[PDB]
Amino acid sequence: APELEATVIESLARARRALEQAQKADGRWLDFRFRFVVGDRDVISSQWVTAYVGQALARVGADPAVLRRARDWLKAHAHKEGGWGFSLATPADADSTANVVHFLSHTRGEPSDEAALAEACARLLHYWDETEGGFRTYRPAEQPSLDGWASYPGSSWCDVHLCVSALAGRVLHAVGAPRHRPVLEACAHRVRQRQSPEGFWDAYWWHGRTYTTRHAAELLQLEGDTSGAVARAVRWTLDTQREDGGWGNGIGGASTAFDTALALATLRLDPGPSGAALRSGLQWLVRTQRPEGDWDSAPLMRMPRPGEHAPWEDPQGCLLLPVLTDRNRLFTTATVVSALADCLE
């Protein structure tokens, strides 16, 4: 498909530019905005978003200086303990930390870079639950936090989370250290067991059915699963594509770039029946790309109340805060860039 391939290459170039140009002078990317108290300052994600955007740009061979500035920022802005989190204004967490590992997995060979990656991996494993065979996003806090961050023992913020476990397994596969293979395989076991009969997976942190599906399906493929999980996830994905060629969140949303990118990344795992669906989804992204080179964001990430242990059962009713949008479009756009790269390879 030469005409499509050229338009996807141009799309990716414009997106890479938009992401690179959004980098702050000190190397960080900022997105997400929220707070719990009206009479306070907004929390903005620095560490998580920096790692996530960095990883996506690393994957597509973006400006090595941009990438280095971001790695250096992350090294100098780790939490005192526990790795990285939304920002230094919040506790550290497994998912932010997994994204740091994922970003650093692209920089291998120099002993300093090996040390930084091994350290990040050690921090990720702090969140590993050996008894349950999954990752908990937050560790139950030692002392009650200052502004009532919901990481206390009993909070669902500290449960084993399927979305985080799926990503963390993929990330550990990218690192490729034998010592981590046991954790990686336990993550795959958990996702295999908890796939819906329909073929999707639910998420704790994500307002939809697209996110865990994408990560869990790839994890199982990387693990060589023979149980049909990947094919069922792809069939579900094919069956849920919208008439405009995009995908939405699967819980009532219209087509978004985020959901479409996740869907495409899922389809590329089993491309045999999927070629027209891949092409139409790529066309949807090409057609809807903003002039700026990014895509429109939508409400994608949900913060459940700590007393809610199954937010997927009540996505509208579980919310501590309104569903978060990445209003700077960097998280959405980084998700797209990864999918475009996947589709070009």
UniProtKB/TrEMBL annotation:
Pfam families: SQHop_cyclase_C. Residues 93-298 form the Squalene cyclase C-terminal domain. InterPro entries: SQ_cyclase_C, Terpenoid_cyclase/PrenylTrfase. SUPFAM superfamilies: Terpenoid cyclases/Protein prenyltransferases. This is Squalene--hopene cyclase. Gene3D superfamilies: 1.50.10.20.
